């Protein structure tokens, strides 16, 4: 046996440790551990509700746009406003544009190197690699000439002997089972990833000004000036402009990242058997479409005990039942209160005492829904979907499964995604959905303005006098988001962020029990104790963002 | 060989590192293959835990007077650093360590410029900036949350290309990007100028891309390179051409402490 | 799906108005012949010549009467019945009135068409008018510039092809979006104009800072455009003022080549 | 005999009509014509000097950039000043990238469709295709999917009933030689062309201010402020940026158009034996690196009845030799005066009388150099560069010619260059070397601006009284151009281009010889006289541009 600590966990946002028990060369128990705070919610406080988006923002700029939106919706849930349509496309395109961006960088640039070996991509054929994707995927970058041009820049950058962002990875390791022909797929992918990404925020920026950290909203609305007939405004030419990037974000998320997800799988099959974090998901609906901040594109719900069929539907931000069962514990966490708090009421107050395995060993809350732990993000939104009948979901996990029975004669149950890849699965399936949400918002907001409608805005009153609470729920990239503002006086008596990372990285609750990071670790092989190559897979499967999930 | 570069994240939100995906000369891919070797970054490392931490050791040995240190976020001093700790230390020991043998400090971004968001209102964790931590040090100040990342790559370039940093201010930020007001070199001046204001979003003015002032642009109090440069590479993309007013994020004292819709004082 | 039909006819042009789409990315060239229009008829990409893309231009004409867009560059001469320029052995001035019969939408694209531009400038050799003066019972839309932002062009026509009619013009007939405001009533040297920060030489102090071009002769203050927003190649920061030039007012009759360089316009 | 006409010509600039007479299916003799005037002469004189280049660049816009350069050029000559060596590598870096655009649109988008049969392409075997460019080339998007997608285009384009631009075409004409792989190869690089034209012509913009037409030029240098620590002026941010479209040029000239070249000459060996159109040669040095407007970067020269091993080197823009040789005559031109004219001494007074084959037919003038006729351009180019010795020329000769021989087991002799393939072979080339000009010229500024030389402009002074010449020497795409400018009391009295297009589309000059064009097409075999696509595949060669040639 013996105590392992990964410290830092490197490919995530911000500072996490990660320790583990391991018992005859298995996980036997796990702590995860958010190591820097910010007090980001004190920072906002007393100020006018108005101004929370620009700083509360700032919690994390991986999640950009997240609880700039997040804010807004907070303060309009406080003061009653309803959100001019053409402001509800501009957030969902951003949104959208957002996510493709920050999915593509998680399972390339943070997530791939887990699994895949650069030193045997040296090896490969390239001829090999490429007749390997035949009839698996019309990409048109999988040449043997690509493949070779990316070899090529491995062996100079090892040659050079400067390995930098890729010295001391996880080479050889007995976990590494890709042949060398599918890791040079990998890296070419890798690459290729970093120029759609580009054009995904292209679309952000377009519209919020630059990203990271948009600049496009308000309570009330947004920013933008619709006028066809402007100049120097959000004119038919700008809007033209969005649109050519919009369209060049399908191909590579559907040939590529799709099918390598596929890849992964077919590969890694044991990793659909370990990394299950919690039997309860929750996801909140998304895109709203009408004038009254509903009308969802997107659906959200409850599943309890991993029951898809007996899940409850959530399809309103202002539904009481979803408000009602959210509380957050620093019982294991470096805050002085540590009873179950409803966000309206919590407070984060520092009590740093170091860290000990029974005691407080995190800067993150333990957030339960109605006294249960609970995984969100994709894996939730995923299975939530899958609960609602969602046709275009089913279509789109069908799809990589028979990638997946193409490439081993293997099918995926329901029961095998409660997993480290089925986690990753629903991340890609949300990535490719996100492609329709933003052609469906773009032709809504060009139908919107040929209407004659040019609105982005209403002006908001807050009375001088009064408590008003308010709660922003946003379905981000890692998962359900919740910004809870009480305005008293005119001003943010209190801010409570909830955030996707908060859930799912929470330590030890007010009961003791685990959250799905701890909990996903139990009975993970570890070959070699000195690198825990197999914990970082399964830890990297949640998109750890530990900026979100302390504040 | 290419330049070595060691990256130290304090209270960083990850913003100023998501700014070198969007750059375009270089790209981020052109960065660390050809331009320089990125020796420690924690955001795109392979390794991690002990193996990122022997990166960290061997490259500061192997290249001691030779790297730049970049750090992002604010550094918190109170309670002996506890508020950020990475391997068990606090991060202003791990900063101090990685200073020593710097040929050159970037301070890139507003929270390690100048304390930024996370050293505003009450500090809950006493939050400061790069250069307060490293006293006897030149720390070279890229503002901005985030800067546009050009104005960091082309701050590395001119120390690789030309063997010394682009020419500084008294606040140490690089006049190429930072010796303006951007109220100074605005488009909307005109409108400024003849009295044509936005009042509400989405008003006629607003709509006709009228100046911002009356939105709180905070533009007359903050120096930068927004309205020009711009971001992003697409062209015309720039807060106050989206719509919005500057919020002044690059500049101590505005962004982060006046309201949005705060007026500005115009010299 | 049936894509709008574009017919396209040169005058006296340059050439320089059709590579300005090739600089386009919304749509790129490609995007806009492939998916955006049909473009029936325009001789510098046309795979047919001659007799046989004579038949082409008259099959347009006949299959799609009342439904295409009508685009000229270069200025039209009149002068000596109109031999100045000939194709297929008639004058051009014919070749566009005939077209004109069956348009949806005409579209003066640059500054010849626009208003006779440089090719009907000083002692006008060729007596060359704009496309407007020889289609006087038509309303011409004007889209100057030598040559315009290709957008200036391309979200005209998507206005017209997306919601039927045209983008709203001023009484040039040229587009608001792009022509509604003086470039220096929304150009970002204002504020060194404002200050008496002047560049007086190109090279000098001044000039290396980015001060204000009035006194190089910058014509800003009497051209209409979007010059300083919009700007050229969509790489960012590409106008002619950016990078160091004056303003030569190409947009605006009675400025570009009329006014010398470092003339200096009026300032209102 | 049988008498046809070609008008328009397409897939050129600018109005042109060839007429041929055919004895027994062979063109017997030739006429081209230049169809529009504008007096672009005219309309420049009795200005500021100054003023010149704004006005004259607007000859042409598809050759954009060389009227403007060749304007300054020669206002300085005239004034006698040497223009500051920065001004020299921004105006070099300007003339290379838009060549680079110029030739690669020339190639594909004017005159691939002439070789090159589109419906055949809807027959090809994508996986055959890319099979064919196994070790011919390495570009990265020569896949089987790359080609599909292309095929799908073009399918849906036919399926739709609409053909626009490929409507009418010579698709199934008995000269279309190529199998349907090469066609389908030809279109998709056709389409991947676009994109490096536009790469180029970002470089172009960013130091002119726009293109299509420069405004950074100046009498005295350019306009470009270079300030390394300056805002909104020309500092190493915006120097990168040029440095980054400026890198992604290469792979495509070197393996595409390069490659292209070698295939279409191998697929079309007969054209490499007709379309001579002159025995007699030029062409001027060109990128100037010294701060006394000289040290060409590239050799010119004047080669005479086709022998390289005698040629005369010209290393200089003063030289008297070349000044003193050029004359122009409208015998056969709708001008008044038809004596060979000194262009410092030239008139431009239109004298349309209608065509005439014995008299006047076209707008273009007769240039002569010492009387005789000569072909400029790319061809000319070439060939003085071989008869120099210039290494990199011959290097990348060999290497179109080492793809020739792999594609058909044949090498050419510089004899078989003197030919409709020949032709376009030189303009390869050029292309090809340009590209080592970018870099070499990039690099030279960032050296010179690290040395402390920031000067980019000497102010002029213009006698207010005298008389006196200058006259400015480029090698434009096309080929030779030359501006001559006459100042008396301060302002231009007299003002003539003669541009390479008027070397190679002038009618019959005074002695009656025939110029290149026309010469070019004697022996033509015209298989369907009323489609004579043999005709236009050898004017295409010559790259028509009648702006230029007549202005
Ligand atoms: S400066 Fe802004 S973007 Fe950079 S770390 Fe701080 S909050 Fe994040
Ligand atoms: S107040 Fe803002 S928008 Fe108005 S001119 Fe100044 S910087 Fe521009
Ligand atoms: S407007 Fe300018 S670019 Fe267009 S045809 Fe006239 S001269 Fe050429
Ligand atoms: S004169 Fe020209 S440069 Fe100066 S502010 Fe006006 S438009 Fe701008
Ligand atoms: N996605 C994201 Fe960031 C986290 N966790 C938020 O919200
Ligand atoms: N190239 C070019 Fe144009 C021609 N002929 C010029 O000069
Ligand atoms: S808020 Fe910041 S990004 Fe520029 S526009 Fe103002 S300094
Ligand atoms: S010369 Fe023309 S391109 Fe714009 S900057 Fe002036 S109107
Ligand atoms: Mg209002
Ligand atoms: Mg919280
Ligand atoms: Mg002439
Ligand atoms: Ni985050
Ligand atoms: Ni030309």
Redo the contacts with the bound molecule.
């Keep these: 046996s013996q105590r392992i600590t990964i410290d830092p966990v490197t490919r995530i ?1 911000g500072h996490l440790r990660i320790d583990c028990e391991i018992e005859n060369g298995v996980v036997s128990k796990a702590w995860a551990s958010g190591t820097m705070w910010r007090g980001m919610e004190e920072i906002v406080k007393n100020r006018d509700p108005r101004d929370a988006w620009m700083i509360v923002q700032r ?2 700029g ?2 950009t746009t ?2 700039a939106l ?1 804010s807004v919706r907070a303060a309009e849930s406080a003061l009653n406003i309803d959100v001019p349509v053409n402001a509800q496309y501009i957030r969902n395109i951003i949104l959208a544009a957002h996510t493709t961006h ?1 999915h593509i960088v998680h399972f390339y640039q943070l997530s791939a190197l887990d699994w895949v070996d650069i030193t045997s991509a040296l090896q490969a054929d390239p001829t090999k690699a490429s007749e390997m994707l035949k009839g698996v995927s019309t990409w048109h970058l999988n040449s043997p000439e690509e493949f070779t041009k990316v070899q090529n820049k491995i062996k100079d950058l090892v040659a050079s002997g400067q390995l930098g962002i890729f010295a001391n990875g996880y080479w050889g390791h007995p976990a590494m089972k890709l042949p060398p022909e599918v890791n040079l797929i990998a890296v070419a992918h890798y690459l290729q990833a970093l120029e759609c990404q580009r054009d995904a925020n292209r679309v952000v920026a377009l519209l919020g000004g630059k990203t990271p950290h948009i600049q496009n909203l308000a309570v009330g609305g947004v920013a933008n000036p619709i006028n066809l007939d402007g100049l120097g405004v959000l004119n038919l030419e700008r809007l033209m402009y969005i649109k050519s990037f919009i369209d060049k974000l399908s191909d590579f998320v559907e040939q590529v990242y799709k099918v390598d997800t596929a890849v992964i799988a077919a590969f890694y099959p044991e990793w659909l058997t370990r990394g299950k974090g919690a039997v309860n998901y929750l996801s909140v609906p998304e895109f709203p479409t009408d004038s009254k901040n509903g009308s969802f594109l997107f659906p959200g719900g409850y599943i309890e005990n991993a029951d898809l069929s007996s899940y409850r539907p959530i399809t309103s931000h202002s539904d009481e039942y979803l408000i009602k069962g959210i509380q957050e514990s620093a019982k294991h966490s470096w805050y002085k209160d540590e009873a179950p708090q409803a966000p309206w009421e919590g407070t984060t107050i520092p009590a740093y005492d170091g860290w000990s395995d029974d005691g407080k060993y995190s800067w993150v809350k333990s957030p339960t829904f109605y006294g249960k732990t609970v995984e969100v ?1 994709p894996l939730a939104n995923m299975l939530v979907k899958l609960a609602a009948g969602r046709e275009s979901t089913q279509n789109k996990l069908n799809e990589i499964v028979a990638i997946y029975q193409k490439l081993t004669g293997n099918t995926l149950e329901v029961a095998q995604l409660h997993s480290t890849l089925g986690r990753i699965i629903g991340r890609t399936v949300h990535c490719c959905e996100l492609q329709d949400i933003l052609q469906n918002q773009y032709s809504a907001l060009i139908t919107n303005i040929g209407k004659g409608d040019h609105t982005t805005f209403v002006k908001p009153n807050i009375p001088a006098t009064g408590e008003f609470k308010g709660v922003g729920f ?1 379905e ?4 359900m ?1 919740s910004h809870w503002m009480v305005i008293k006086d005119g001003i943010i008596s209190n801010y409570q962020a909830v ?4 859930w ?1 990285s929470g330590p030890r609750n007010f009961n003791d029990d685990v959250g799905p990071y701890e909990q996903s670790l139990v009975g993970t092989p570890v070959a070699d104790p000195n690198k825990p190559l197999e914990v970082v897979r399964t830890i990297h499967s949640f ?3 530990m ?3 302390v504040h | 060989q290419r330049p070595p570069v060691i990256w130290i994240g304090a209270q960083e939100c990850t913003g100023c590192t998501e700014s070198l995906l969007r750059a375009t000369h270089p790209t981020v891919e052109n960065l660390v293959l050809e331009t320089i070797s990125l020796e420690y970054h924690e955001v795109l490392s392979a390794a991690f835990g002990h193996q990122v931490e022997e990166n960290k050791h061997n490259a500061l040995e192997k290249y001691k007077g030779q790297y730049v240190l970049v750090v992002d976020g604010s550094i918190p001093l109170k309670d002996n650093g506890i508020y950020c700790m990475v391997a068990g230390e606090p991060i202003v020991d791990h900063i101090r360590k990685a200073a020593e043998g710097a040929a050159a400090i970037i301070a890139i971004g507003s929270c390690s410029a100048w304390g930024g968001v996370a050293a505003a209102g009450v500090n809950p964790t006493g939050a400061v900036s790069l250069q307060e931590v490293l006293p006897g040090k030149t720390v070279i100040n890229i503002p901005g949350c985030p800067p546009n990342p050009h104005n960091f790559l082309a701050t590395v370039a001119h120390i690789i290309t030309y063997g010394k940093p682009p020419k500084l201010d008294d606040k140490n930020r690089p006049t190429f990007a930072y010796g303006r007001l951007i109220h100074e070199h605005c488009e909307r001046r005109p409108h400024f100028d003849a009295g044509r204001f936005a009042k509400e979003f989405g008003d006629e003015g607003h709509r006709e891309g009228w100046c911002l002032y009356h939105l709180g642009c905070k533009g007359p109090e903050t120096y930068g390179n927004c309205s020009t440069l711009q971001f992003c590479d697409v062209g015309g993309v720039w807060p106050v051409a989206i719509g919005h007013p500057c919020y002044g994020c690059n500049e101590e004292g505005i962004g982060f402490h006046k309201g949005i819709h705060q007026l500005a004082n115009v010299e």
Tied chains: 1, 4.
């Design positions: 946002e919690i994390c991986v999640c997240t609880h997040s920050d993000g946003l981000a990239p890692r998962g988001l955030v996707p990372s908060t799912n998109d750890p963002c900026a979100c999930a």
